[PDB]
Amino acid sequence: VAECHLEGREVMMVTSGAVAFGKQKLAQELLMSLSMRETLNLEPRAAAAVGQSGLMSLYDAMFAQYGVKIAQVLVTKPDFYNEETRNNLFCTLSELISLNIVPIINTNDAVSPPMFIPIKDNDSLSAMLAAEVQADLLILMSDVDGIY
Amino acid sequence: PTFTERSQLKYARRLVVKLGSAVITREDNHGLALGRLASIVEQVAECHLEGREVMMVTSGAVAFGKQKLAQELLMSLSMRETLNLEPRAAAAVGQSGLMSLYDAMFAQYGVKIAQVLVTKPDFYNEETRNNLFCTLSELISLNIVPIINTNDAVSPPMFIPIKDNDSLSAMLAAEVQADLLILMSDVDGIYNKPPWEDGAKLMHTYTSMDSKVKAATWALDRGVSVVICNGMQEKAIKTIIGGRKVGTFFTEATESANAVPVEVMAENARTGSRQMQALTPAQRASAVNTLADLLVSREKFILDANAKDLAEAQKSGLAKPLLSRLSLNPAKLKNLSVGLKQIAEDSHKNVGRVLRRTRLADQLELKQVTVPIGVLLVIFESRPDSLPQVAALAMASANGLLLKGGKEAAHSNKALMELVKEALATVGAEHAVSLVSTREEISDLLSMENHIDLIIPRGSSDLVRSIQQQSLHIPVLGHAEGVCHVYIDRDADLEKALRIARDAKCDYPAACNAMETLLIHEDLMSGAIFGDVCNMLKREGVKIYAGPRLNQQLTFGPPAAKSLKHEYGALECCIEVVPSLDEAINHIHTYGSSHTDVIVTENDAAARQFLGSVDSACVFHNASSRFADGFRFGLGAEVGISTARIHARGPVGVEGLLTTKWILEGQDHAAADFAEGGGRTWLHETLPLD
Amino acid sequence: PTFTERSQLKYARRLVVKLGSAVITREDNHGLALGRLASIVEQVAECHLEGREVMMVTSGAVAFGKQKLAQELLMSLSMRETLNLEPRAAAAVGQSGLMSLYDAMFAQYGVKIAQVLVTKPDFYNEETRNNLFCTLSELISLNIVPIINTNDAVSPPMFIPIKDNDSLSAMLAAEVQADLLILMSDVDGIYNKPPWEDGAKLMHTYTSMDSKVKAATWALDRGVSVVICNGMQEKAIKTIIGGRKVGTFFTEATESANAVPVEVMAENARTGSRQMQALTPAQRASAVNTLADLLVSREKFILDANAKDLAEAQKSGLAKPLLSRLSLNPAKLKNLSVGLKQIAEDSHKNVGRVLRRTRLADQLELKQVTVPIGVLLVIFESRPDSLPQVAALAMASANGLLLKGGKEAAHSNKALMELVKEALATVGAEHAVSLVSTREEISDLLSMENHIDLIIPRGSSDLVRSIQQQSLHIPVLGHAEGVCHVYIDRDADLEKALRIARDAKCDYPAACNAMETLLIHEDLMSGAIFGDVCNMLKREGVKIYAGPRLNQQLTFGPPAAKSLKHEYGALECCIEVVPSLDEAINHIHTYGSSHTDVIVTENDAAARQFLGSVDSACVFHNASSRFADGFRFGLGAEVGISTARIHARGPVGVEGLLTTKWILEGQDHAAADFAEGGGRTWLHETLPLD
């Protein structure tokens, strides 16, 4: 992405997987808080918060290794019904992209996970976004080889 | 509110820290203030590696974002344009960068963080509010510092009603039911009037920026106790929780603690002075007389007052002097009754005595007369005896008096206070005397100006030095070191010098004016006197040190002396020996604190030159250093001893508590009238004062 | 050394900062002190984003490594062992972690860093040394902050000779030929004796820890100028380069600047006092007399001294008062010659006057006599006239005197100083008078204790307030605000009150005792007086404000007043009007600074009660507030005006410059002798002093 953005294009990442990272960190900081006796014999929201913070820090370091700068924009389900809010969000995204800054969008899992076009994950959000910003190409880097 | 006093904060279990947008970013807007951020993060990391539960509410993402956007915009113009910031985008950039910085700074301490971003609508859906608080609790209970901030990126709430990152802090710290809420703004606290005026005093306690005050009040009514400090002050959090006085403390105590706190009692007594000033002829003489019979008529009340107070203090057993000089007996009162009955008659013309009478022109006769000082402040130990004794001067000097001792002998103090305020209520129409003990935060009273006039430490040399190290911006009295000295001349009879050193040291070594050194002519070492003195010492068991010109002089000798300017207070006294009187002169001026010196000699030429040349507070001749008591001077009941060189030399009697004032009674005279155009000649005829 | 004065540091081009291992790590050894590290890195980043060239020499990799190794060792024991550090490895770990932290903190400012690790042998191969310095220069010239440290990992040099991270700093900063070298240790600077003693004074300048001193000396001889400060002090670098006095400055100036610097001149004059104390009978009277003819015999030298000095100052044109009251004329000297010739005769018995004569027992006759204060310090503006005038009191008060004005009128000051020190050299055998002007760092002299006694600001109300805001730990004299007041009673004749307000204000509005308010009875507003006063004002063009009870009272009226406690100093004077004399009383006590007040009235009952109740420094009756001059009091040449309530009330004449002392001439008396066992009775017979 850094080299496809140091070439003139305008990338805009939509990261998922804050919850998994948070679950790892919470497992560690829980196992490291039992009494010595118990050793001898994970709500999604908290994990989401921890994972989001740690992941943004990692992204920031990795990108600043290339001179690029990033910024995180956290949206929710209701923020796509207030038309004034939707327009403000897209004006913000455009103003950011036009300054050679890679935004990073993710659903505000910390206080209102949308899991509980209808936005239901970090995929429908990607489709809606890339349709509104009127991007050219939309890449879905899943874990499967494609479609069978 | 579970906390009321600023000393109960060491037990604060759940904190909530807020960082105003003026603490984070610098002024010239060229980056962060890593100094203040790292100081605050170090303080939080160590207040969280100690068991507490902190939860920061950071503001100032917008300022940081504006900086970053200014840079990344200026770095995107065409080279030609060079040669001649919506809040949302800046908020996003700043939030990301700031979280990264926090994460690095905290991970430098093993701690972990997590960011929770809330909005305005997320505080109306009760299910959402409950989920948020369950999340916050589950996070705090895992030893993870959350960091809350409004989601400025997509819905800044700027456009209890949450309107900023302050009302949010209040609402949060009220819902999590934290103990302490710290608002680290950029101002020093809270003033009564804006800082650019007169009267811009700092309120160290808010008794029950307008946004901060509003939120602080709302949050106080839910049990939370808030403290507002200056973020740009070093070691802010660790000294607030440390208990020391910093910033403004919001609390409720006013009805709980007392209604006689500090200030009016100064002005009340001050006005009482103005009143008591009108009680000169035999009136204040009666004021001590009405207290005379009172003390002889209320033994039972004051004895039991001290008895149970002596009783509850004896079990403590702090140290000898308090445990020895805190009791009370009707015997002492008879000693107290006889003194003030003499202080009754002697003070007939303290105030209102004429000093100068000079006529400048016809019907132009100025003069200069005595006036009381006003609101004193005498500071003493747990000794209920001096309190009604030195007050006998106050009611003899028509001047307002305050008092402060300690927690010990309290019950006797309150009783003795109702004794005297009564007498003033009997005659005086007003109590210009107010005991305000019980941790008045001695500096607090000391920091006051134009209310009190003079400080007089009474307790002991330990208490007086605490003042000298603390006292500032206010006149001070009272001895600090009683490093007396003696001298023996090469023609001085020994047996006198023996009993003198005997009397000077073996009378009351606890006194300030007790001698703590002694000198002799060097030629006298061959006069067998050295043994005779050390003989007298062992007769009383006096630990003797020695000085350089003595150490080399004697072979076996006594042990060495640490520093000639040292003091003992017990049966110890160095001995130095020097040939030259001039060296002896230089010795005192270089080591002696000019407190009290003496000579003993049989050559008057040395006497006359010794006395006149030395500059002690008082010199003597064939006498002890145990006369600095004022009473023995035939002067009267002093109130202390002066080391300074202004207004007071040694025994501060009654005159040391007065002050002068000029009046002038003209008829039609003016200043330019004195010029040759006006028929005004300057007579300056000093007429005899009546 | 290209720099000598601590104000020449703003132009330091190449710095070298060193960070002792006690600045980086905390005390309890539980992580870094991110507070101090981030403060130092912020200061360096902003002193390097300003054009300078910094180059840090960090120490303390070993301590950080020891912490990390303790952790990673305690976290590697078997669970059973839990239930009941070679320098090299710690150095490696600490170096890596510390470089990472530095890199993050600096990249927060856009700056870039690079680490250069040297050893002991790398300073002997001359080709290696030259390559190293070429590398350092090539790095610095690219706006990159290098960070040098000894390669502790594989060859710690602990086991000019490089022996630590200090000698390395000296060698480096000498080879790169830097300008300033900062050693940020953990101590406050350099003391003469170790801090746990008496005499542990901080040397603010080292005139040409033992390792630091050794390296600092060696580095000073190569042009480098070193400064040693306390790393644990906030904003250390930015205030050193800022020029302010912090830490110890190593320099060479002593022979360059002067040989009469500060301290001895105090004690020299102090000893001169001891000498001049022996010049009472017509001697110090001659001392002013030998200066009397001197001033009438050296006009040419002093006129040209001031003439060219007036001349070189006129082109500057700072402001009116200096530009107006700096010139000198033989006319002024004739005015100067007549004053001190009167000061000659009047001071015949200032020192040595008996105050008390009381006999306690047979051949036991104490007394109390006058004594000079000692080493004064009077602070004044560019006014060569007062200097030989107030000094005429010093030589009349047998007390040591210092002086400090400014750079203006300097040549006249030095000349006037050689005038007087001569007179003392003629009679006095010693000059107990020393002018030490030219930026004595007023606080420096003020910070001194037991050398000087009293401060007397002379310049103007601006100068005196600078003292009051600065002055501490030392007695102070001198007025601060001359907020005078007047009052008119409801039975007071108008035309008198007219000329009084006329005279009080239109004589010299620049005076401190010039009235800056005026009150009238409310009933008198219907007596046509209000116009008559404002009529008189416009006759002189006096800008009039008004107060609350006046503002509402009049409809058209004059403009409003900012604050009743304000002062003008020019032709401006508020007017308030109040019915109650008691309110008028309360008005002064609440607003007036008790400096100088007056009444004008035809009802004596009001007069008697007004005067006695008010507590100004001096009150009057049918007269102006323009009498506070001492000379007009028929008292003598005063030296100022006292706002305080101790030792001095209004015009400090000659008595205000003396002090008392007790002597006692016994024969064989002792303290315990007074007890009933010894035949000693207390007579206390006050005998008439001769």
Author numbering:
A (entry chain B): 88 to 128, 140 to 214, 228 to 259
B (entry chain C), C (entry chain A): 45 to 128, 140 to 214, 228 to 276, 295 to 776
Paper text:
The bifunctional enzyme Δ1-pyrroline-5-carboxylate synthase (P5CS) is vital to the synthesis of proline and ornithine, playing an essential role in human health and agriculture. The P5CS molecule contains two domains, GK and GPR, catalyzing the first and second steps in the biosynthesis of proline from glutamate. The GK domain catalyzes glutamate phosphorylation, and the GPR domain catalyzes the NADPH-dependent reduction of γ-glutamyl phosphate (G5P) to glutamate-γ-semialdehyde (GSA). Our results describe the assembly mechanism of P5CS filaments, in which the GK domain forms tetramer and the GPR domain forms dimer structure, and both domains form specific interaction interfaces.
